[PDB]
Enzyme design. Structure first.
Site, short mmCIF file in Angstrom:
data_model
loop_
_atom_site.label_atom_id
_atom_site.label_comp_id
_atom_site.label_asym_id
_atom_site.label_seq_id
_atom_site.Cartn_x
_atom_site.Cartn_y
_atom_site.Cartn_z
N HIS A 1 -8.24 9.77 -8.90
CA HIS A 1 -8.78 8.38 -8.93
C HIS A 1 -9.67 8.03 -7.75
CE1 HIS A 1 -5.99 6.98 -5.80
NE2 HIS A 1 -6.49 5.76 -5.91
N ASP B 1 -2.13 11.32 -6.91
CA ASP B 1 -3.33 10.90 -7.56
C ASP B 1 -4.60 11.06 -6.73
OD1 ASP B 1 -4.04 8.13 -9.77
OD2 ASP B 1 -5.23 9.88 -9.14
N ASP C 1 -7.38 -0.74 -5.87
CA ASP C 1 -6.29 -0.24 -6.71
C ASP C 1 -5.50 -1.34 -7.42
OD1 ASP C 1 -5.76 2.06 -4.18
OD2 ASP C 1 -6.11 2.76 -6.17
N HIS D 1 -12.20 4.24 -5.79
CA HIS D 1 -12.61 3.86 -4.43
C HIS D 1 -14.09 4.13 -4.14
CE1 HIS D 1 -8.52 2.81 -3.29
NE2 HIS D 1 -8.10 3.98 -3.73
O1 LIG Z 1 -6.29 5.74 -2.30
C1 LIG Z 1 -5.52 6.82 -1.66
C2 LIG Z 1 -5.99 8.17 -1.09
C3 LIG Z 1 -6.98 8.27 -0.13
C4 LIG Z 1 -7.36 9.52 0.32
C5 LIG Z 1 -6.76 10.67 -0.20
C6 LIG Z 1 -5.78 10.58 -1.18
C7 LIG Z 1 -5.38 9.33 -1.65
C8 LIG Z 1 -4.29 9.19 -2.73
C9 LIG Z 1 -3.65 8.01 -2.96
C10 LIG Z 1 -4.11 6.70 -2.32
O2 LIG Z 1 -4.22 5.60 -3.26
FE LIG Z 2 -6.26 4.20 -4.60
#
Ligand SMILES: O[C@@H]1c2ccccc2C=C[C@@H]1O
Ligand SMILES: [Fe+3]
Ligand SMILES: O[C@@H]1c2ccccc2C=C[C@@H]1O
Ligand SMILES: O[C@@H]1c2ccccc2C=C[C@@H]1O
Ligand code: FES
Ligand code: FES
Ligand code: FES
Ligand SMILES: [Fe+3]
Ligand SMILES: [Fe+3]
Lengths: 193, 447, 193, 193, 447, 447
Positions: free
Chosen positions: F208, F205, F362, F213
């Site tokens: 997202h 993912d 999350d 974030h």
């Molecule tokens: O938030 C994260 C993350 C940080 C930075 C790069 C890829 C991701 C993918 C999944 C993790 O939840």
């Molecule tokens: Fe995340």
């Protein structure tokens, strides 16, 4: 002290309330408030509801606990009633509630309930315009146990105004609580916070 | 359990198996046959009056977004993102033109349509059929004089037809008074009871008022205070009970316009209601004009209840067999002066809200009756609802529905539960109709 | 202050206890009591059970916690034992419990438990007849955590008597708790309230 | 006072901390500490995070909350890292967390959260070597409510150092919490204890 | 799971599947086949001595009212209103001539009969057959020297026959001592264990005492203190174990009259018991007179346990597969001086009550053993109870029952679990009897 | 539900039924077909380096003891006593030569063998076959460069083969960097989400990150900060996605060696990683050397996730369908200076630990998406994972596995869920293999 344009999560009401305690602090007033609230909580804990009314509650009291609807941090168009009143009692309405508690046919009161209150974070300051009016803020944890295995715990901050009345006794003239849990998980809110 | 054959509710709705208040497999089956099939209260026009206004509501255990469209209609959608299933809206009310999911940023309009996807061109190209990815929409949304109900089942009867004979009783207050508004936000409290316990209590339980509420009656000095502790017989002809085909039913207590309201409001209300009644006499007739200022304790099947005049409006939201989330609103007549509206709303919460001293009287009754339904020796026992059986009538010249010409009886329980068996044992609306072809005969049997 | 014929929910015992604090309040005694109880709770929280005994507990102590049977508000004929004693310890019995806590084969003590106590609502008054006897009332929330995900929270009001003894140190000579929950939902009541 | 060879459950750290409060007690310092902590908790409760930083937190602060691995009471060979740091923040790291709280795209902050803190058991003593350094110990119950029916309650003892800085204002220069629950049952520990 | 065929307990009760302590479907099945079929402790005469006296008790998950009738007998009824199912009595003990339901006011007598209905004439006329609406009555209520047990199953054997060979062991203390009284009220604490964990522990677990209770033994200085930390072998012939047809069983520790009581009571007890033993020698014989002042750790199947001499009396009330509500009473000899009775009761609670330092030692053992029963890799694993197998006897000349002539073994677990399989796989008492026709042979097999 | 026939995951893993995140019967079925069959993370050599060192870990809902043997190997055993089922070890880590049960004192060695039984000679004689009473042993325990995994199923492929095409991506950091160590102890927090929600999120993912974030990116000033609020398109060729036969998969974000770490660590990391990359170019080649300092968001099927470079290492321990216990460790390169190791570990917890401000973003996403899976109208709805479908490749000349040559897509969800259907509908490993004979073709279909 607070600038609510920079401290973006702070409400105007909250910023106003804090200002009234950060200024001149009076150690003895804090101590008087501590005593008042401890004695009030003792009376309530032993269910001396008539005594509480007679000794702690002013004839012009407004006893109010609200439940505020959850709205968007960024909401600015929707303007309808923001909360409901769980309590919004005058002295007579409090008396009715006290009579309901003491009625021998209040079946929910047998066997006898058990209350324990914990009052903390007391702050006190005299009002700037009414020199007879004392602002008291305190937080309360109220534990209620009944019927073997029912236990409900309530948590709240109380914004009070207290004033000397009959016989020079300082009495509650306003209590305001903005109840922090939107959906109560305690069966009801039938307790005097 | 085979719900096609299991007799959960006996003939004429004379008794119900106690397990109905505690059985979790039945609860799951009710989600399908009661809550996904029937009409459920959502909101009121007064709460979402302007385009873009929305609220969230429960429909059974599902959460929906209910939104006022630009054209003035209301549509409702599951509050669940079409991508990975996150809850879209986390507030209770607001105004907006769309909702954006906080997980991956998909943006849906107030009309449910998928309107934007971040980086759609670069990621999905033209492969995303947005037209097929709109929020899951509640099939049916209808209004009863401002009160908005939803139904997931496209085959349901229209809401007006669903209200059946109960509609005639509600119309004086809901229609001929000029209209009602609901005062929000609601109180919200979880109780450890099955949703059917308060539902059955509001639909036809006047018998409990004198005993259960002895303390509140005596303390509040309301108009019904003489009943405290079953001290006083209510007069002959003090009211009646009714029920209908689709389960809705109510008690009628003649002239009790101030309802549960303590003495501080009794004079003003009684004056207000009487003045309106006087003008209504000419428009709708003496009988209906009096129904208007008579206290109706009603349940709109399955889980919406109310006390007209008192102004109490409840949704018994199901969580599990021994858990319900109670939403409490105040209903006021739109042409009441504002100050009176404000005070009535406080009085409704004072009596029936989260700290409602009346509502507290009922807590133990509902919670223990429900929880006893799980206890081994009680599961197969019979809850009784035979009070007044064999004195109810059908097709009366003046009062419609299956009607008990007495203030206190169990007529409305019987109709509520006859409708409940028919649904729980039926797979669709057509089968409910077939199971209900002789409903009023089943209910009046020995008369 | 309380008339128990009018304040129908109030017990005679409770009405008697309140009287002893509403009268002459002594600000410094309240402060001494606050210090005593805070230091006691600190010793207990770090599990210095021997120190607690040596510094906070009098040789003539009665340490008592009861569980009262639920009876009808209107009960007046049934007269059998009203409660049971969860604790009713003399100093030697407390020492036995302390030895049990410190024994290296008390398997339930490994890994080490974590205690946090919150003492509030302190009131203090000298006894009218024994001028060396101090009455202290306080409420306690006691949080106990162990083995990753076990958390138990206890709530109680404590009616204490404290007296100066060896070296002039004020020590506990009586603690009485009427435990508010009839059926405990905390695995046990194996904590010093 | 404590001999840790006899009080077998007591850690050396804990025995050291207690010593620093049992000695000369200063009633006014206890009162100053009470005020400081109450005002800090008020600012935090209303989410005036910028104000908290400006008025309560020193530029050289170490803000630390640890989670200690559960090990045998009798463990003496295994010597690897005993705990992890839930928080171990300098002022800049606290500012980052404050900016995260105030960002309008912090979706978890809408609708607005509700915090209520209860601070108890305050003790205060000046440091023996740095006469400008005040040691303050207090216990906190922190109640967090959000989104209708989420309620998390946190319980901890706080070992603080506070020092006068800019404008003579006493500010936090070290906060240490050894969090009592090993496995958190509160969704996260995203709160300022 | 098919309980007719599933081997939950292996032949001779040598092992049990770990899932029995965690499986909720099995728990539900136990409500039927264990708790609705067998004898369960209710109360003691000493707690309800006068007409109108009552207590509430659990029977499995059901709650009952146990009331002393005017004629001196005791009857018990479900604590559930016959109208809409509300819990009738909300207190634990009292004195009254009847119970009134707080919902609609129906009033039942101490004898269970529906005696009054508010406004019966005006509402029900003569349509209510009150004779058919009495509280649901516990079919069987019998006494064992003052100790009152109930059974929902009319087909159960009489309690005396149900106690089987265990009765012979209990009689010296329960009958020949002059009689016991139970000192209430009980402590009540919920633990996160299956009811069978403490039940099996009290029925035949002397092996754990030295290790589990090392700290309490060493700290209390009780008569059994030499066992602390398995420091000391208990002498040859220090006791025995026994079990019976219907599952009841116990450990016997010769002469341990002061039991778990700390040194402050040891001298007085040992004197008291020895004096009585001296007079009993002439009435019942040396062997039985000594049994009288010997510590018996017994479980009366299924969920009532006790430690004679120590005076501990327990009910392990089932809530769910990993939840039990523990009730703790003190048992005292009626002819003990009052001050000694008072002190023994405090000592019982001090050691085995809600803050019982001994009882606390057992918490982790019971809770984790039960909870491990839900864990995937443990469900099909075998709990062992083979200690002493092939040395037990049947029909001994002096000690009756299936008996292990040693203080420490697993004889009583085997008998408890052989009785448990027979019930769980049987539909009624007749089938249990058929499954139990060779019980003692199954238990002594290799001897 | 018939898991042989029920389509829980559609062809090519394009969608999944929402109920998979909420159905408890499915959860129970996963214990068998996912957790008892596959490889699960236990610990790292760095945590149990010396003989006698042990930790406890979960494997699905079971708890195991993982112990370093005298010969240097590692064995793991159920943390459950072979006698009556008590949990043997109550701490998280330690050093010992054996474990003694606190119930009856049985003592087992670090090698699982029953070594001593109190009073064995006097009680059991020679009847106890100790050789048959050793702790239940985890059938398979293997290491991947120090990282120790266990599997209850003897028929599982070797761990290296199980990692499939994902192994090639991990090797630069796990093997060619000199080796990693895990810094304990872990943070441990319970969330109200299904274990699959965070698992799917970490496996593929990237979509997202910019939205979920936004606040953390903007506040921390980390290297990925330009994505905040989907402000900025990530460059063409900024990364890729991959998946493998047995379900493991990951996102690759080129050069992002400082990962989520706030600006205070960015310069030192970027320098450290670049220097190593320079030496690696000669040993393993430019491409793999760059993979080494590229941020990999990976899930090792089923419930172990990690963020290389950032150094985050997670175990999503299943409790029930809407409950997971999250364990959070920090991973560091062994040849990093100690002070940098210390600071990286704090930064990992600062961002992704119990008070991780990123991890908090999350929470709502995972919890509500999981809980919505229980809601009636959502159970049969389809979670979408079609982003990038028909552009993925198999057998690329440079990047192995089923690969999406773009930084943001749903390639890895599809591979995770294709592996999940195959297991849930299969009874053993042989059937999984048969169901997976055309895995990569199923995944690349329209390309
Ligand atoms: O938030 C994260 C993350 C940080 C930075 C790069 C890829 C991701 C993918 C999944 C993790 O939840
Ligand atoms: Fe995340
Ligand atoms: O308590 C209420 C009430 C008050 C007044 C009249 C009828 C009713 C019936 C149901 C409600 O519970
Ligand atoms: O701990 C107890 C005990 C004490 C003393 C003698 C036997 C026993 C057996 C079972 C009880 O748990
Ligand atoms: S779950 Fe809503 S955008 Fe992905
Ligand atoms: S439920 Fe008892 S009288 Fe109606
Ligand atoms: S349960 Fe472990 S020795 Fe008995
Ligand atoms: Fe009512
Ligand atoms: Fe024991």
């Amino acid at each position: 002290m607070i600038n609510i344009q920079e401290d973006k999560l702070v409400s105007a009401h909250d910023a106003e309330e804090i200002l009234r305690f950060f200024n001149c602090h009076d150690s003895a007033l804090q101590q008087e408030a501590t005593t008042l609230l401890t004695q009030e909580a003792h009376l309530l804990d032993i269910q001396a509801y008539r005594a509480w009314l007679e000794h702690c509650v002013g004839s012009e009291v407004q006893y109010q606990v609200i439940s505020r609807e959850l709205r968007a941090a960024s909401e600015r168009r929707y303007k309808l009633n923001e909360a409901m009143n769980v309590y919004n009692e005058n002295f007579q309405q409090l008396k009715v509630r006290v009579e309901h508690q003491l009625d021998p046919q209040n079946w929910g009161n047998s066997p006898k309930l058990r209350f324990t209150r914990f009052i903390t974070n007391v702050q006190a300051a005299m009002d700037v315009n009414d020199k007879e009016l004392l602002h008291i803020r305190s937080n309360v944890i109220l534990h209620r146990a009944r019927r073997g295995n029912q236990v409900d715990v309530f948590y709240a901050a109380r914004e009070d105004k207290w004033k000397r009345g009959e016989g020079g006794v300082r009495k509650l003239v306003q209590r305001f609580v903005d109840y922090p849990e939107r959906i109560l998980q305690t069966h009801n809110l039938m307790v005097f916070l | 359990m085979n719900y096609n054959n299991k007799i959960l509710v006996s003939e004429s709705g004379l008794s119900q198996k106690h397990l109905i208040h505690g059985d979790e497999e039945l609860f799951q089956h009710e989600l399908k046959t009661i809550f996904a099939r029937n009409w459920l209260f959502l909101t009121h026009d007064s709460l979402i009056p302007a385009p873009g206004d929305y609220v969230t509501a429960k429909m059974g255990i599902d959460e929906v977004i209910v939104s006022r469209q630009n054209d003035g209609s209301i549509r409702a959608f599951l509050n669940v993102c079409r991508h990975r299933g996150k809850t879209l809206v986390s507030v209770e009310a607001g105004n907006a033109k769309g909702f954006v999911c906080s997980y991956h940023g998909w943006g849906f309009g107030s009309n449910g349509e998928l309107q934007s996807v971040p980086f759609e061109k670069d990621l999905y190209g033209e492969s995303l059929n947005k037209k097929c990815l709109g929020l899951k929409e509640v099939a049916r949304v209808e209004s009863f004089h401002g009160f908005i109900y939803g139904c997931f089942d496209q085959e349901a009867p229209p809401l007006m037809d669903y209200l059946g004979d109960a509609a005639w009783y509600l119309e004086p207050m809901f229609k001929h008074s000029g209209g009602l508004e609901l005062v929000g936000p609601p109180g919200k409290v979880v109780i450890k009871a099955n949703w059917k316990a308060p539902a059955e209590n509001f639909v036809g339980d006047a018998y409990h008022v004198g005993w259960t509420h002895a303390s509140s009656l005596r303390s509040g000095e309301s108009i019904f205070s003489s009943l405290a502790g079953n001290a006083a017989l209510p007069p002959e002809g003090a009211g009646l009970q009714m029920t209908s085909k689709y389960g809705s039913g109510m008690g009628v207590l003649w002239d009790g316009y101030s309802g549960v309201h303590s003495a501080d409001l009794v004079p003003e209300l009684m004056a207000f209601g009487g003045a309106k009644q006087e003008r209504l006499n000419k428009e709708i007739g003496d009988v209906r004009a009096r129904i208007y200022r008579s206290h109706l304790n009603c349940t709109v099947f399955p889980n919406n209840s109310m006390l007209t005049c008192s102004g109490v409006f409840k949704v018994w939201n199901p969580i599990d067999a021994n858990t319900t989330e109670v939403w409490t609103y105040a209903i006021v007549e739109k042409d009441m002066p504002e100050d009176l509206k404000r005070r009535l709303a406080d009085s409704v919460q004072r009596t029936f809200g989260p700290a409602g001293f009346w509502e507290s009287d009922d807590n133990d009754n509902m919670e223990t009756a429900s929880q006893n339904g799980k206890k081994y020796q009680s599961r197969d026992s019979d809850l009784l609802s035979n009070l007044g059986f064999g004195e109810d009538v059908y097709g009366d010249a003046v009062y419609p529905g299956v009607v008990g010409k007495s203030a206190i009886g169990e007529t409305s329980y019987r109709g509520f539960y006859r409708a409940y068996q028919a649904h729980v044992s039926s797979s669709n609306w057509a089968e409910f109709e077939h199971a209900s072809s002789t409903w009023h005969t089943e209910l009046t049997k020995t008369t």
